[PDB]
Amino acid sequence: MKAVVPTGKIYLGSPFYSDAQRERAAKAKELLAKNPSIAHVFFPFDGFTDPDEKPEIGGIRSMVWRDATYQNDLTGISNATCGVFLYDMDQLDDGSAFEIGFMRAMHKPVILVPFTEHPEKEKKMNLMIAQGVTTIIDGNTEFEKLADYNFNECPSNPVRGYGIY
Amino acid sequence: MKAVVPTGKIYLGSPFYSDAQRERAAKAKELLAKNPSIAHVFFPFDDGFTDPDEKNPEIGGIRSMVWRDATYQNDLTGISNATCGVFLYDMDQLDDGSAFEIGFMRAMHKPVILVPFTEHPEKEKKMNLMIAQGVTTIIDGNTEFEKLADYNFNECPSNPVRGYGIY
Amino acid sequence: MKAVVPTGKIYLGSPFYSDAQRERAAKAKELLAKNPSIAHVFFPFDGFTDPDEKPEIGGIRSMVWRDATYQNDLTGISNATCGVFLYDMDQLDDGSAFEIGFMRAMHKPVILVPFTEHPEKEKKMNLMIAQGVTTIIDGNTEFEKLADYNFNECPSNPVRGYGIY
Amino acid sequence: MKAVVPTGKIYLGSPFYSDAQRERAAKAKELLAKNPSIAHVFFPFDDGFTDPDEKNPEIGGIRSMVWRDATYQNDLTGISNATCGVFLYDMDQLDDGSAFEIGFMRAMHKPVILVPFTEHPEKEKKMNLMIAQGVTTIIDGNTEFEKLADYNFNECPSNPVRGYGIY
Amino acid sequence: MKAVVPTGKIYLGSPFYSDAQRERAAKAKELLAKNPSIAHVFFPFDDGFTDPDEKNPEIGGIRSMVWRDATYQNDLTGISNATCGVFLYDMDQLDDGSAFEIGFMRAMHKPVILVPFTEHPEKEKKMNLMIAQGVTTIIDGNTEFEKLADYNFNECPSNPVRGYGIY
Amino acid sequence: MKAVVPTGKIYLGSPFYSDAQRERAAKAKELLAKNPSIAHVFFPFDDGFTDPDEKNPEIGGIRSMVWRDATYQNDLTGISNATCGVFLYDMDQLDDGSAFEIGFMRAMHKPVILVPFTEHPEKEKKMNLMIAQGVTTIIDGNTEFEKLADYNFNECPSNPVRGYGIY
Ligand SMILES: Nc1ncnc2[nH]cnc12
Ligand SMILES: Nc1ncnc2[nH]cnc12
Ligand SMILES: Nc1ncnc2[nH]cnc12
Ligand SMILES: Nc1ncnc2[nH]cnc12
Ligand SMILES: Nc1ncnc2[nH]cnc12
Ligand SMILES: Nc1ncnc2[nH]cnc12
Ligand SMILES: *[C@H]1O[C@H](CO)[C@@H](O)[C@@H]1F
Ligand SMILES: *[C@H]1O[C@H](CO)[C@@H](O)[C@@H]1F
Ligand SMILES: *[C@H]1O[C@H](CO)[C@@H](O)[C@@H]1F
Ligand SMILES: *[C@H]1O[C@H](CO)[C@@H](O)[C@@H]1F
Ligand SMILES: *[C@H]1O[C@H](CO)[C@@H](O)[C@@H]1F
Ligand SMILES: *[C@H]1O[C@H](CO)[C@@H](O)[C@@H]1F
Q1: Which domains does chain A have, with CATH numbers?
Q2: Which residues bind adenine (chains B, D, E, F) (predicted)?
Q3: How many CB pairs under 8 A join E and F?
Q4: If you measure CA to CA, which chain A residue comes closest to F3?
């Protein structure tokens, strides 16, 4: 069980469209950087440059940039042994959801790290995410556990306490 | 081309939480039924699983692990059996269940038709890169919904997503 | 939901090493032949002939026969949309177990049809089979349900009442 | 056993660059059309995608990324939809497209029928190990081409490659 | 060859119900620990999952669906993370869990080393075709057990099963 | 981001039939050995299996089924173990083994680096669509061969094929 060399290769999936999201991503990187079971961490937003493209975020992008970037995202999933998703429960990110579905189809373990700023709302979650994810670590209450989780074995921890959408 | 018998097995993916979404799903069923290239259409919300041990089932409540396991598997089984995915994609209230399913289907190399809908046609046209590039064929829900009745599901012709801003 | 044409393509996995096993296989074929949701049924024991092989069952077989037969078994799994396994709980068949594991890795649904002649023994089952299988139909008490099960949708039915090995 | 309906869905892989190559493809379609076990035959060069933004497309020159994606994806969609691959393999002018497709299909555990063709029936028989071991069934194109009309695509019986020198 | 750092990630599959089996697993761990090509060894019976809701856990009894789900997933996660499978295969009391795992690994195209053991060396040498052909490398548990300490897990050299009757 | 240990495991795919081909492979090994991001490089022609029953094996002639299986499987095991494929692609003499391997890897969603080589740098640049769209990164062998020594195999940045006519 004890690793001769770190084998955990993380695909850190996450939205990067707001300040809070960019902040959670920043913290996750630091926490994972402290985990002795990790060999490498891949963060998709850390980019391809199409020479022909004369381009703004949210604007029309060249097909070549799209292909290269999309492949870069899939390549990270292929190289990775585990997925860690900073899941925004308030503003659902279909990019992250697609990626979680993609990883599970490849039989790779997925750590869901849900974040919410509206604790008032009843804890609900889509069935596919609740049953697709292999391990859940609460981002609001247990974020720091990422620094100690054993990514060499990726022990399961089924989602519970959440009502199904 | 020129199928002896219909070979299209559709996984009709869609959210089913609001009236507008349910209406789309109902209409999609009608249109697909008129397509001669289709052999079967699987809609995940049709038949559910019943856990005899589950006391008083609350739609939206906790729910037993047995029911969860069975239902989740039914949704994957539909993908496994299907030759193609057809998603009634809500662009106003993103459905992560739907997105998980699109990613799962593409990892299995199955073609995916995206039928996006919006109640606000005037708003900015933007799509997540994973959906814009993952999907193999797009058919606008708002203006080309009817094409589902004639689209050739025996071959599933590609039609890359274009005209959408990417973030 | 209602199929325009039958789409159920069955991989009928089963041992074929005893009289009881050969009998259960015979009955399953007849039952499935009555199910209107089935397009085709594949039974691996229905064979390749290596011209060079000068051969008896259980004896040393040529590598060419092995490859051809093994591939024939995998090809049936590939063509199939669903697996139906006449699972002998008394004399475990690793061939069938391998095949169940293979099918689930391909995300295909698996119907377990367990048979036992020793009801006395506590109902036990290996975790991998209990959790790997998607639907369970008791062969001793519900064998006939194969003639009516909807293989167009393959509805789930989790294994229960079995103690884990 | 006996199929209630034809279930074989063929991915007819083949180069389409010489007259001899296109003649074989034409003949292959005819033979398969006569096979009772076939539900559908997909030939990659049949349809084709048209890119509206592609001004004066030159077949053999630079193609738009959109056309490349749509076309490549159509080629993979056929593999996904198919239950078995049938390759009109030109042993004289190796086609990497066909070889890529054979490997892709095998990674998916799908059976692959190799139908080798040579304009020099008397020359030494040699085949790359990947092709020779990757394919699940061989039907010689020079002498057994006609067998495509009777081969049981509902079950796809093996038949390992033998008689070819391995390099 | 010539790895900069060890890359072998072993999924040590094995039954763990009898004393003889447990002894084999313990010895296998020792031998693998001496192999410089190994980076990690995962043994499914090492750390288990604890369902706080599960009252009095009875090893062999019913058991909660939550514990079942978690444990089953732990066993698949080990396969996913692993680069190679190493199965201490009991030839006297066949373990279907082990067999399921070998089939799962081969469907993912991962190499599998079979280390068969028997308490009756004089009995007929017979193996199920799926195991004999599915496995990529065989190392006899009874006479070559020690090889696990020197086998190159960075490359996993093939060694087809031979000398076993097939049924 | 920065890797704590090298994580790139390369499947160095390549034909090995001409002097020029073997010279490139030799150079490729040297360049990769200098790359800090590489943990291991697998070259299919390095080891090799020996069949005891194979009397006087002729490299190029008929090989035993046992040798064929062991060797083919070693070639697939390298792909399974690898995180990325690097192909010394001979643009003059197409190699179906390499093409099969490229397709197989892509079906597995693994990145593929194409390193094309031509003895005629001035001739028309044309590539099969499957190869041109299948590969995720291109590094010209004639002018950028040296980049293999610095390319980041821990992350494998894309770089779509462009500039080649598609057929
Ligand atoms: N890597 C990436 N994934 C998704 N959207 C993006 N936008 C910019 N870079 C991106
Ligand atoms: N089939 C289904 N899939 C996902 N969530 C559901 N909720 C109720 N039925 C469902
Ligand atoms: N198809 C088959 N599968 C397994 N063992 C066999 N023995 C003979 N035919 C067989
Ligand atoms: N389907 C196809 N595959 C490969 N090259 C092509 N050129 C035109 N159509 C093609
Ligand atoms: N890890 C495990 N896998 C399978 N069965 C088990 N029973 C107890 N622990 C187990
Ligand atoms: N590894 C290998 N792959 C293909 N052909 C070969 N001939 C000898 N070794 C070989
Ligand atoms: C793809 O999906 C998300 C963004 O929506 C990222 O995790 C990854 F790049
Ligand atoms: C899983 O995703 C959606 C619900 O969110 C359905 O299509 C399918 F059941
Ligand atoms: C492979 O496994 C069993 C025999 O042990 C059959 O189901 C199939 F042929
Ligand atoms: C892809 O490869 C060949 C042509 O090179 C076709 O079979 C298919 F379109
Ligand atoms: C699953 O199979 C066996 C137990 O039967 C273990 O190796 C693994 F946990
Ligand atoms: C299989 O294909 C080529 C040789 O044809 C090698 O890369 C690998 F061994």
Answers
A1: 1-165 (3.40.50.450)
A2: 44, 75, 167
A3: 63
A4: A40
